Amino acid sequence: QVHLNQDEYKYLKQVEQILREGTRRDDRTGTGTISIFGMQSKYCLRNGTIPLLTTKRVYWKGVLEELLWFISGSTDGKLLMEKNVKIWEKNGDRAFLDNLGFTSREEGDLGPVYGFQWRHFGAKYVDCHTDYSGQGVDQLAEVIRQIKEQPDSRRIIMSAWNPSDLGQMVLPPCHTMCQFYVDNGELSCQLYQRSGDMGLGVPFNLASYGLLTHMIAKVCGLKPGTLVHTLGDAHVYSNHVDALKIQLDREPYAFPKIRFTRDVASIDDFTSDMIALDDYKCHPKIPM
Amino acid sequence: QVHLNQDEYKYLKQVEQILREGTRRDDRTGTGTISIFGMQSKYCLRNGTIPLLTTKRVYWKGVLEELLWFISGSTDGKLLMEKNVKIWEKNGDRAFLDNLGFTSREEGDLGPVYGFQWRHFGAKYVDCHTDYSGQGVDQLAEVIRQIKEQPDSRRIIMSAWNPSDLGQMVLPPCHTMCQFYVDNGELSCQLYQRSGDMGLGVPFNLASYGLLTHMIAKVCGLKPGTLVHTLGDAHVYSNHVDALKIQLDREPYAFPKIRFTRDVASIDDFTSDMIALDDYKCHPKIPM
Numbered sequence: 001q002v003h004l005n006q007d008e009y010k011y012l013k014q015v016e017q018i019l020r021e022g023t024r025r026d027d028r029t030g031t032g033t034i035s036i037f038g039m040q041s042k043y044c045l046r047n048g049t050i051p052l053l054t055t056k057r058v059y060w061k062g063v064l065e066e067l068l069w070f071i072s073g074s075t076d077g078k079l080l081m082e083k084n085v086k087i088w089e090k091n092g093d094r095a096f097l098d099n100l101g102f103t104s105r106e107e108g109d110l111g112p113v114y115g116f117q118w119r120h121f122g123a124k125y126v127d128c129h130t131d132y133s134g135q136g137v138d139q140l141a142e143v144i145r146q147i148k149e150q151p152d153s154r155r156i157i158m159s160a161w162n163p164s165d166l167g168q169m170v171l172p173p174c175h176t177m178c179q180f181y182v183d184n185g186e187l188s189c190q191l192y193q194r195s196g197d198m199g200l201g202v203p204f205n206l207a208s209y210g211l212l213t214h215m216i217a218k219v220c221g222l223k224p225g226t227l228v229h230t231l232g233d234a235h236v237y238s239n240h241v242d243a244l245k246i247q248l249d250r251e252p253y254a255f256p257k258i259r260f261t262r263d264v265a266s267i268d269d270f271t272s273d274m275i276a277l278d279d280y281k282c283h284p285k286i287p288m
Numbered sequence: 289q290v291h292l293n294q295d296e297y298k299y300l301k302q303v304e305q306i307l308r309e310g311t312r313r314d315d316r317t318g319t320g321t322i323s324i325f326g327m328q329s330k331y332c333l334r335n336g337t338i339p340l341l342t343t344k345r346v347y348w349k350g351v352l353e354e355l356l357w358f359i360s361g362s363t364d365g366k367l368l369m370e371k372n373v374k375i376w377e378k379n380g381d382r383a384f385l386d387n388l389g390f391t392s393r394e395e396g397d398l399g400p401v402y403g404f405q406w407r408h409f410g411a412k413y414v415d416c417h418t419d420y421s422g423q424g425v426d427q428l429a430e431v432i433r434q435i436k437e438q439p440d441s442r443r444i445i446m447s448a449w450n451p452s453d454l455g456q457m458v459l460p461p462c463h464t465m466c467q468f469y470v471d472n473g474e475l476s477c478q479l480y481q482r483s484g485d486m487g488l489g490v491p492f493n494l495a496s497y498g499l500l501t502h503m504i505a506k507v508c509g510l511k512p513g514t515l516v517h518t519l520g521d522a523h524v525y526s527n528h529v530d531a532l533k534i535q536l537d538r539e540p541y542a543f544p545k546i547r548f549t550r551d552v553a554s555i556d557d558f559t560s561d562m563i564a565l566d567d568y569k570c571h572p573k574i575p576m
Contacts, residue, residue, distance in 0.1 A: 023471050027440045037469040037476050038516030040328040122452035137451040152313065154483035154521050155460050161447050163425035164410035172443050177465065179482055179520045181325045183311050190326050190520055192480055194467055195442035228326035230518050232467045232478060233442045 007043045008054060008252035014039055015198050016248055018236055032238035039231040043210065045224035046186075048257035050210040050277070053203040055250040057282040062087050063207045064275055067215075071140065071267060073119035076128035077108035091170045100170065111168040117160040125168060143180060144267060147220045151182035175205050180216070186225030189213040194232040199240055199247075202231070211275075214258045219267050243286045256280035295331045296341060296540035302327055303486050304536055306524055314526070323523040331498065333476075333512035336545035338498040338565070341491045343538040345570040350375050351495045352560055355503075359428065359555060361407035364416035366396035379458045388458065399456040405448035413456060431468055432555060435508045439470035463493050468504070474513035475505040482520040487528060490519070499563075502546045507555050531574045544568035 003009040022034040043051040052058050065085045077092035090096060092108040105111070112125035116132070123136030139158040146156045159177035166172050178191040191209045196202040206229055217224045236244055259276040291297040310322040331339040340346050353373045365380035378384060380396040390399070393415070400413035404420070411424030427446040434444045447465035454460050466479040479497045484490040498515050505512045524532060547564040 025440070025471060035471070037471070037514070038328065038330060038478050038518070040326065040518065042326060139451055157449060157464065157482065159447070159449055159451070159465075161445060161449070161465065163427055163447070166425075172445075176445065177449065177480075181521060183313070183323070183325075188325050192465070192518075194445065226325070230326075230328065230480070233469060 003252065005054065005252035005254050007041075007051060008255070010041055011053065012055065012248050012252070014041060014234070015236065015244060018198065018234060019241065019244065022235070024238060033235040034238055034241075035233050035235040036231075037233055039234045041229050043206070043227040043229070045188075045210060045213055045227055048214070048224075048259065048278075049255050050207065050214060050258045051227060052207045052210070052256055052277070052280055054253040054255065054280075054282050055247050056199065056203065056286055058203045058207050059087075060207070060277060060280070061085060063204060063211060064272060067208050067211055068270060068272065070115040070118060071270075073115045073132065074128070075110045075113055075116045075125075077110055081108070096170065102168075102170075110170045112162070112165040113169045113171075114160045114173055117162050117165070117173070118158055121159075121162060122164075125165065140267060144216060144219055147180055147182060147187065147216065147222070156180040156182075174201065175209070178209060178212075180213075181225075182222065183225070185223055187213060187217040187220065187222045188225035188228065190228035190230060192230045192232070196231060196234065198234060198236050199244065202229070202234070205229075211258065215260075215264075215267065215270060218260055218264060243288070246286055250283050253281040253283075254279070291540060293342065293540035293542050295329075295339060296343065296543070298329055299341065299486075299491075300343065300536050300540070302329060302522070303524065303532060306486065306522060307529065307532065310523070312526065318527055320526040321523040322526055323521055325521055327519040327522040329517050331494070331515040331517070333498060333501060333515055336502070336512070336547065336566075337543045338495065338502065338546045339515060339543055340495045340498070340565075340568055342541040342543065342568075342570050343535050344487065344491065345573070346491045346495050347375075348495070348565060348568065349373060351492060351499060352563060355496050355499055356558060356560060358403040358406060359558070361403045361420065362416065363398045363401050363404050364396050365398055369396070384458065390456075390458075398458045400450070400453040401457045401459070402448045402461055405450050405453070405461070406446055409447075409450060410452075413453065428555060432504060432507055435468060435470060435475065435504065435510070441470075444468040444470075462489060463497070466497060466500075468501075469513070470510065471513065473511055475501055475508065475510045476513035476515070477501040477504075478516035478518060480518045480520070484519060484522065486522060486524050487532070490517070490522070493517075499546065502548075503555065503558060506548055506552060531576050534574050535571075538571050541569045541571075542567070 018036050022036045024034050026032050062085050065083050077088040097105045109128040118140050119138050120132045120136030123132050143158050146153050157179050160173035161176045176192050181188045257278045261274045306324050310324045314320040350373050353371050365376040397416040406428050407426050408420040408424030411420045431444050431446050434441045445467050448461035449464040463479050463481050469476045545566045549562045
């Protein structure tokens with residue numbers, strides 16, 4: 001019946017649903033997945049709560065460093081590698097780039113992905129060492145202005161889905177857009193994730209938009225509300241079902257709370273040292 | 289427990305949930321709303337079924353003609369008016385245009401809306417009488433190629449959300465994006481609608497993407513699967529509650545079926561005379 005962390009329990013029920021009601025496919029590699037097309041869940045962000053899953057740990061440094069890098073507008077994966085965050089290494093390496101025909105592209109130059117679109121949508125991409133200041137639509141700045149000045153708006157949207165630029169990206173954005181919404185002094189967010197693995201990328205992006213919503217709420221002087229996570233192809237790998245069945249039997253801990261330890265001048269004024277995560281309790285590792 | 293048309297019944301339950309749980313934005317242009325942020329529903333498209341609501345009739349001619357007009361890349365509202373379809377008339381009229389600063393635009397020139405983005409994303413908009421061939425990304429052609437050639441793809445997306453062009457549109461698009469998905473020889477679709485009235489725009493867009501999915505399935509030699517309708521701000525007007533309550537007590541009829549009465553060369557080869565709608569039975573208009 002009742003769980004201390006009902007929001008994570010509902011996530012586990014989604015995973016169970018995929019295993020029971022999804023469809024098995026094998027892609028061109030012989031790689032097996034079980035999928036449901038179309039899912040949606042909600043997470044309370046009140047009182048500092050951030051939905052960092054507890055039944056299978058999430059790579060917090062990766063979430064946090066990637067998000068600051070997105071916000072900065074960077075498209076240079078080497079900047080993450082300098083921080084020992086390797087999540088974009090394979091997608092920016094020589095071999096991956098050359099397979100896409102990007103044979104003159106510097107290693108780690110991801111093309112006009114995520115943060116370039118968020119801060120410079122429509123600008124002419126050159127490389128990941130170019131100053132784009134003042135170029136393109138600063139969607140993130142706009143969202144913040146709308147939230148502060150026009151909180152009733154039904155139009156508060158940010159998207160990295162830029163058809164004109166997809167061909168130069170190492171891959172299309174996975175979290176393709178988000179919409180913000182304000183009511184009774186609280187900031188809510190809905191993201192759309194076109195693809196993801198319930199064992200890895202879904203929890204990772206859940207956490208990243210939880211963090212982003214708390215950051216924007218601080219910038220805008222609002223309280224956090226609800227995070228809505230919408231999925232396209234929600235899937236698990238068929239070879240992981242044993243590991244998943246382990247996860248499913250675990251009782252979630254309460255989510256941790258986020259704390260920002262100094263004032264910020266703007267969304268561009270966060271640094272890793274001042275983002276604190278309190279009381280993250282997590283279950284042990286899950287074998288193969 | 290189950291109903292003849294369970295899919296429509298689940299829509300009714302969404303409306304009931306907004307009435308019971310939603311939050312109010314009161315005003316007094318008599319336009320207050322009751323809202324939930326983040327909803328999702330699904331509709332089976334098997335065997336020709338198209339989800340045109342039965343408990344409150346949907347304007348099918350409008351749905352049909354608007355979608356053929358979108359597909360054509362048109363942005364000239366006068367083409368709809370010539371078919372006796374008036375849904376875009378107020379947003380293209382002289383006063384509406386002038387109030388946006390579009391003082392030199394021809395009446396009915398909606399700007400770079402929907403169909404222009406679908407067929408020419410990134411092209412340089414001029415007017416609603418300009419040829420844009422070869423200009424911008426033909427997203428609709430790309431989604432059809434992917435369905436046919438890469439049915440496994442998790443990247444099959446079309447969007448009118450173009451930050452660079454929003455300021456020249458009469459309205460930003462309401463259905464902001466959709467994703468397609470292929471399994472077991474069947475085509476599914478998920479749309480994202482950032483805002484809508486459960487009583488009007490939501491059912492209209494439900495029907496439009498149902499039709500689109502049937503059309504694309506025919507082009508691609510597939511069977512129709514499921515339509516997923518995801519909402520941002522899902523709302524009803526507080527002054528329609530009495531009507532809604534009558535409506536919510538009605539037992540839905542089976543949905544009608546679509547029938548295409550000739551072969552098509554491509555997605556551009558449909559005409560209204562070959563799209564038949566069979567057995568669209570509705571409950572009566574609620575007078576109030």
